[PDB]
Structure 1
Amino acid sequence: SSSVEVSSESYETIFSQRIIRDLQKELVVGALFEELPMSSKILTMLVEPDAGKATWVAASTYGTDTTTGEEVKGALKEIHFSTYKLAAKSFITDETEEDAIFSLLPLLRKRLIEAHAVSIEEAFMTGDGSGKPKGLLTLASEDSAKVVTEAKADGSVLVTAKTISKLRRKLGRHGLKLSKLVLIVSMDAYYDLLEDEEWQDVAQVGNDSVKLQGQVGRIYGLPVVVSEYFPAKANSAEFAVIVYKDNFVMPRQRAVTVERERQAGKQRDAYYVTQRVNLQRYFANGVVSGTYAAS
């Protein structure tokens, strides 16, 4: 207060209507995959399995050869889309909006959608496949995706461009190159990625650093992102290499919706939010994990 003038009541400030936050982790998982819209509770896609064969005839006949004479058979696994239901709910109280300033409901909706967004992405990164989707680390293991060795982990780590050269070789037949592929990195590993001989200085210029989507990094045209959702200790994970449009679509028959119930116990509003979403894949696999998988 004081201040030494004729009248009291110096400055009390003001309650500013704005929602501040820190710089928490970013939602990279739910942002780089395409969407498959569906109209019912199963869907099938007729997959052509790579084939053909041109017999060519080196003699002047007439009646030889029948190219093609019979043709390839359907790869009916099937490739079903099993659509898990995730949902959330809240409560809101008629009685306390008048007491305050009527600003609680817009910030209530944002924290509910951000919490739902974190819940879906952490599940898409890491999951079993029980009552919820199975994430990529669990999935990249029905195939031999785990690579060896990492040279050194825990005590005196060092990461170099030789690591990505192992991964782009171990993939190679189950995943292409050029356009596009994506790499997801731990925040921890990005703290070690300073210098590694050739090329100098991480990824510069790399063409043209950054332009096309990816929150920093451009090693040879490959885009990089950080998900901050990997543990540390001798057997863990660091890099995850993921396909872009070429498999790994997310299916759904509905967008985000927000319902409002009331009473709900005497007088009281509530909000119910429902989604239905999962991740599925085409062809064989297309991912590599490890890396960071020995001792």
Structure 2
Amino acid sequence: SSESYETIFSQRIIRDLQKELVVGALFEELPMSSKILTMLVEPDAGKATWVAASTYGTDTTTGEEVKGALKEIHFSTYKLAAKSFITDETEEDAIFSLLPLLRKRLIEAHAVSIEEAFMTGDGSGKPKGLLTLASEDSAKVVTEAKADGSVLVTAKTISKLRRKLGRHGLKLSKLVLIVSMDAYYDLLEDEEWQDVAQVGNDSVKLQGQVGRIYGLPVVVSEYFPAKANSAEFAVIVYKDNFVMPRQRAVTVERERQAGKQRDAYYVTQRVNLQRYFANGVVSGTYAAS
């Protein structure tokens, strides 16, 4: 029947497209197939293992040369659950294909949760989230905005945080700005757009994130808690900071019972957010401070 395999293909292709929900996350996905990828090295934090091997490699401090840097880079991803049976008693009515409506919105809120979880997440069962991974670095900085009163907040914030991102990547590759539309309510209908806030299409040009700040493009929408004390921002180079360490995904089991006769579409998903450095991001802040 349906509620079964012939769905899943026509289901995971829907997943293959909101795969591209880009509404915060899009990196180079590490694919997996085992379980943990655990790497036993210290990354880029001074090595840069340059050699003369010849002259004199300054015989004093330090050697490695600074903290740290092995975490270690373990990567067992996260089995992500969604779940919702349907009217599993009524495609005996051979509808084949009310599910083109009736599915996919499951993939909708499913991915809604995915990206929210991705950018606001605890660590566990998922991995971490953005403002959460902001929230132990003291990237909560001070005090570019002031408690959502005299919030006319420009990019001086972004200027000194750009100088914070004058860092070890580049300038403006990638260097982004997942934002808020209230953060846009600062700098949409701004008269400036000083450097650039608007139009930031600007043509249209980059990914789908229009509005840019010297090319710091835009992701708003239902993630930032308001009243000034979350970030307005997400100033992170997408390159150096983070990839996706995914493995599988949907191999949803459309199991049946589940009583009063309905079909447990036990929804699977397996991707990851994980980092390397000490810092990858400062954002906002934009605080009640």
TM-score (norm 1): 0.73
1:126–1:138 Cα contact (<8 Å) kept: yes
C-alpha contact 2:245 2:271 (8 A) present in aligned 1? yes
Q: Are the structure 2 counterparts of residues 122 and 27 from structure 1 closer, same or farther at C-alpha, using a change threshold of 3 Å?
A: same
Q: Distance in 2 between matches of 1:217 and 1:261?
A: 45
- Range with greater deviation from structure 2 (245-254 or 257-266): 257-266
Cα deviations across residues 125-146 of structure 1 (Å, max 9, x unaligned)?
2122244322111111333311
- Equivalences for residues 1-295 of structure 1 within 5 A: 27-29=21-23, 31-45=25-39, 47=41, 49=43, 75-97=69-91, 103-173=97-167, 176-194=170-188, 202-203=196-197, 208-265=202-259, 267-295=261-289
Q: Does 91-100 or 17-26 show the bigger shift?
A: 17-26
Inter-CA distance 25–150: structure 2 relative to 1 (3 Å threshold): farther
Matches of 1:118 and 1:61, distance apart in 2: 57
Distance 1:249 1:97, change over 3 A: same
Query: What RMSD over aligned residues (CA atoms) do the two structures have, in Å?
Result: 8.2
Query: Which sections of structure 1, spanning at least 5 residues, go unmatched?
Result: 1-6
1:3 alignment partner in structure 2: none
- Take 1:67 and 1:263, find their aligned partners in 2: how far apart are those partners? 66
CA separation of 1:101 and 1:293: change in aligned 2, threshold 3 A: same
Identity in percent = 100
User: 2:90 & 2:149 partners in 1: Cα distance?
Assistant: 55
Question: Counterpart of 2:267 in 1: which secondary structure?
Answer: strand
Mapped contact 1:27–1:227 kept (Cα < 8 A): no
Shift of 1:118: 1.0
Residues 74-115 of structure 1: per-residue CA shift (max 9 Å, x gap):
943211124222112222345333569665322232121112
Contact 1:140–1:288, Cα closer than 8 Å, also in 2: yes
Change (3 A) 1:259 1:30: farther
Q: Give, in angstroms, the shift of residue 261 of structure 1.
A: 1.9
Cα distance in 2 for residues equivalent to 1:11 and 1:142 = 44
Counterpart of 1:29 in 2: which secondary structure?
coil
Give the CA deviation at 1:197.
6.8
The answer to whether the Cα contact below 8 Å between 2:80 and 2:125 also exists between their aligned partners in 1 is: no
Per mean C-alpha deviation after superposition, the further-off stretch among 227-236 and 183-192 is 227-236
Q: How much does 1:178 deviate?
A: 3.5
Farther off after superposition, 204-213 or 156-165: 204-213
CA offsets 1:227-263 (integer angstroms, 9 cap, x no match): 3311122422211123213221111221323332234
State whether residues 35 and 250 of structure 1, in contact with CA within 8 Å, keep that contact through their aligned partners in structure 2: yes
SS at match of 2:54: coil
Task: Pick closer, same or farther for the CA change 1:265–1:175 going to 2, 3 Å.
Answer: same
Structure 1 distance, partners of 2:163, 2:57, is 46
- The CA distance in 1 between the partners of 2:201 and 2:45, in whole Å, is 36
The alpha-carbon distance between structure 1 residues 121 and 53, as it changes in their structure 2 partners (threshold 3 A), is closer
1:68 Cα deviation (Å)? 15
Tell me if structure 1 keeps the 8 A contact 2:24–2:119.
no
Once structures 1 and 2 are overlaid, which stretch shifts more, 191-200 or 162-171?
A: 191-200
Contact map agreement 1:248 1:280 (CA 8 A) in 2: yes
Cα 1:144/1:175, change in 2 over 3 Å:
farther
Cα-to-partner distance string for 1:35-82 (whole Å, 9 max, x where unaligned): 011232211335465589999999999999999999999943211124
Q: CA deviation at 1:269?
A: 3.0
User: Whole-Å Cα distance in 1 between the matches of residues 235 and 285 of structure 2?
Assistant: 11
2:139·2:283 contact (CA, 8 Å) conserved in 1? yes
Partners of 2:50 and 2:12 in 1: how far apart? 74
Measured after TM superposition, the shift of residue 165 of structure 1 is: 0.4
Alpha-carbon distance in structure 2 between the residues aligned to 1:182 and 1:155? 25
2:36–2:74 Cα contact (<8 Å) kept? yes
Instruction: Tell me the CA shift for residue 150 of structure 1.
Output: 2.0
Q: Which runs of 5+ in 2 are unaligned?
A: none
Give the Cα–Cα distance (whole angstroms) in 2 for the partners of residues 82 and 172 of structure 1: 32
